[model samples]
Target: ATLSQVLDFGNNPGDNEMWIYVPDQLAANPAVIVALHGCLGSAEGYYSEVQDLPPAADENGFILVYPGSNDDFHCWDVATAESLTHDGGSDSRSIVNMVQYTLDKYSGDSSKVFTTGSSSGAMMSLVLAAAYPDVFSGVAAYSGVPYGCLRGSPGSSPFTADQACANGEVSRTAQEWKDEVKMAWPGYNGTYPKVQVWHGTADSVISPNNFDEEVKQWSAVFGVNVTKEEQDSPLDGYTRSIFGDGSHFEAYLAEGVGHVVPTQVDSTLRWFGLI
Candidate 1:
């Protein structure tokens, strides 16, 4: 249960904090996960939210990274121009550097790396997947907007996200949504990271309409036709859908639910093929 901080892990261009946990008897060529904290959240605070991971890693042997943001609200920089551009130096780049640091230090398996988080952290996950698709194999975003949908409007500050996105007013076609991500890396057509999204139908903070937008963006990125599945449940309020075979994309919207997602780590594990 010891989480150690690495002050000078690598080129921390975004000035974020890096915290890692390594279980005893670490397995050979272990997998690594970079988990970010939500707005107003800290590395330590995000731990209990994902407490399932440590115990799971205890037996299976994987490395966990809790990346702390430099923002006053502790939000990762997903909206900035630098953040949206590939290797353009943002919190997104710092995060990729953190993963590389872990891989080197732990001799981690590059193919098994994944990123997951909620809210602002989830927003950051989209940024990471678009910017560093070659690095992370899977992405799990719990309550986040689409990649590049939060850029500053007009002459506003770059640190400011477009309020329209959170208001769920920014509608676009799937190709347009995919084009938003394409601008980040230009043209280097390769398979993107598989993505899983979790949102609440009753969420007003970021609005559930963003869920519809996310599926459009990711499905287009994977070039898959998405279709709805039945209302899924270990709980009663969930509805899910798959883009193609779900090899590339999936989403969950909880009916009458609110902003935050609680206790669903195993699904992320299963998506990462870690379980």
Candidate 2:
């Protein structure tokens, strides 16, 4: 893998830094995967060791961009109201700007951009996909909650917003949830981005129920019925539950995995068609 460092590309808010990885054998218009790190996780840590994304990128010939969080907690600003919307000083907007910078600088395929993250980063990934569906083709969220559930008071700390995380319930009907997503991006009539949700059954950090809510939320956005397509114990001590049409929206339940990215990283890459 080849690494490139970018500082404040496109004048992003906070002048955040990003580390990009390109495979040795590059493609003309390589797909771009923007991987966000969890709370207290750095871009270099995630890119170098935390996950198997870089290895997958190396094998699949896609560009992997890891953007560091600007907050003192090193968490994406997904819990704030401003970060929930587009075109603001929000981290979501900054990430979008980073994507544009990557495309402009690397000639990446605009249509093939994807996002994935774990924990808090996973929530940010969902926010980005919902707020800018036209920008991301697919999103994979691991151990995350629904988009707006974390939006506490203007300056509330995410760690202290326990109620916000627990309140990530899908109390509304499918149409209602779809309407909420529509409201997030006015005049967005295009198809919603494909989503892949992964949550460990043993994840104690974020309740496993959030996985169900997330599947409900994204499935509603895609207007797809919840259907169990397959169940397999591919990884030892891990049973995977497949849902949706196996395209627009899917959920994977890792039985024994904790609050971490699943070891099935290659499967996720294949789902995104990167391999």
RMSD for all candidates, in order, please: 2.1, 2.4
Q: How many steric clashes does model 1 contain?
A: 0
lDDT of 1 at 187: 82
lDDT (tens digit, per residue) of candidate 2 on 14-131: 4466888988877789899988888778888777654577777777778888888857478787656567776656688788888998898889899999998888778888888878
TM of each candidate vs. truth: 0.94, 0.90
- In the predicted model 2, the residue pairs found to clash are none
Error of 1 at 96 (Å): 0.5
Q: Summarize candidate 1's per-residue lDDT along 109-157 as a digit string, tens digits.
A: 9999999998888888988899888998999999888988876543112
Q: How far is candidate 2 from the true structure (C-alpha RMSD, Å)?
A: 2.4
List per-prediction Cα lDDT, in the order shown: 0.84, 0.75
